[PDB]
Design a protein around this ligand. Structure first.
Ligand SMILES: Nc1nc2c(ncn2[C@@H]2O[C@H](COP(=O)(O)OP(=O)(O)CP(=O)(O)O)[C@@H](O)[C@H]2O)c(=O)[nH]1
Ligand SMILES: Nc1nc2c(ncn2[C@@H]2O[C@H](COP(=O)(O)OP(=O)(O)CP(=O)(O)O)[C@@H](O)[C@H]2O)c(=O)[nH]1
Ligand SMILES: [Mg+2]
Ligand SMILES: [Mg+2]
Lengths: 189, 186
């Protein structure tokens, strides 16, 4: 049967794993975030046909720069994630993630994914960011970065409340649908 | 250019038109709501390619009946709508709507759409339903009907709050794609 491979990249603490667990188990892991870097599968109906959506988690720490690319082969679509309450992670999108992804897979599309949006309305978080003269990343600022980096589009969500979650992956699926053309797919090689 | 035609059908007072207006303009029609079955359109990017999604509105009144079938030609997918706070509209789903669509277009797939889910929390709508010894339709019930009716699946939304709106059309699009062997209504 038909398959789509999606790889999730982004800095540590961005919420990549929670994003995948909430989506695949419809339940945010509030007790203990699984430590293992795994890959998940979910079957999705597309035009009355079964499709397997392969979601691949990655290690965001700099210690894995040499090994991370090993997961990129055959990738149909990339999810480049950053936390909206983490200006640092947002800047690494342009400085580190898109460059890395385009270097190894120039033709493969990617979506810019803002995460942890529930924290934008968290007094505590605002205060912490304020004490350093920082404010949450806004959808407008992110949309501009997505446009300039040539991302398919900018989407955002919260794995906690699950808001915008399903949307992120519906969009990843739409961006992944490889036009039948003989053979000129954007699958990474 | 690639096109997908989606026709919305359902009882009156359900909110079919408000649903289409809210999705296409991203705002609920308060000041005024068209009395016309005006058809809309939106461009959606799929696999790097431009697709034009055509949304065709219709009348649910028992009068508009036979004329209504005139908009079915070339329909890739239907959205059988019903208001969750209207058990009446829910019964007409199986009793009328599904039967019609399947009658005219036996191959064309359809989604079961619950609307006005913003009112299940609203007090009044509850009390008024209590008088008739009735309660708001539940997702559990809808999913059952959707399954028994051979629907692609069930989805619900609120043209008002806009909760689940984009998801409804994302699913509608998903259900319309395919390599003759098409379910296009003819
Ligand atoms: N408020 C809120 N917190 C979240 C959300 N998603 C994840 N978190 C929190 O962010 C922290 C990191 O989440 P995690 O999924 O482990 O991040 P990661 O990107 O996998 C980090 P690593 O790459 O090292 O695995 C945890 O405290 C997790 O609970 C969210 O949607 N909302
Ligand atoms: N509270 C609330 N009211 C809604 C919502 N959607 C529609 N309505 C209301 O339902 C009533 C009818 O909506 P409308 O979209 O015209 O339904 P329709 O199916 O087009 C009726 P017709 O078959 O005649 O075209 C109006 O009062 C409209 O404001 C909703 O999501 N929330
Ligand atoms: Mg992780
Ligand atoms: Mg109307």
């Amino acid at each position: 049967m038909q398959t789509i491979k999606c790889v999730v990249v982004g800095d540590g603490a961005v919420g990549k794993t929670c994003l995948l667990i909430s989506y695949t188990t419809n339940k945010f892991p509030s007790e203990y975030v699984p430590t293992v870097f795994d890959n998940y599968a979910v079957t999705v109906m597309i035009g009355g046909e079964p499709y397997t959506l392969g979601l691949f988690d990655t290690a965001g720490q700099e210690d894995y720069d040499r090994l991370r690319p090993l997961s990129y082969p055959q990738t149909d679509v990339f999810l480049v994630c950053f936390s909206v309450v983490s200006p640092s992670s947002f800047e690494n999108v342009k400085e580190k993630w898109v460059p890395e992804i385009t270097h190894h897979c120039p033709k493969t599309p990617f979506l810019l994914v803002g995460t942890q949006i529930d924290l934008r309305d968290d007094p505590s978080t605002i205060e912490k960011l304020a004490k350093n003269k920082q404010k949450p990343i806004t959808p407008e600022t992110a949309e501009k970065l997505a446009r300039d980096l040539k991302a398919v589009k900018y989407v955002e969500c919260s794995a906690l409340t699950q808001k915008g979650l399903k949307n992120v992956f519906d969009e990843a699926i739409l961006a992944a649908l490889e036009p039948p053309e003989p053979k000129k797919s954007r699958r990474c090689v």
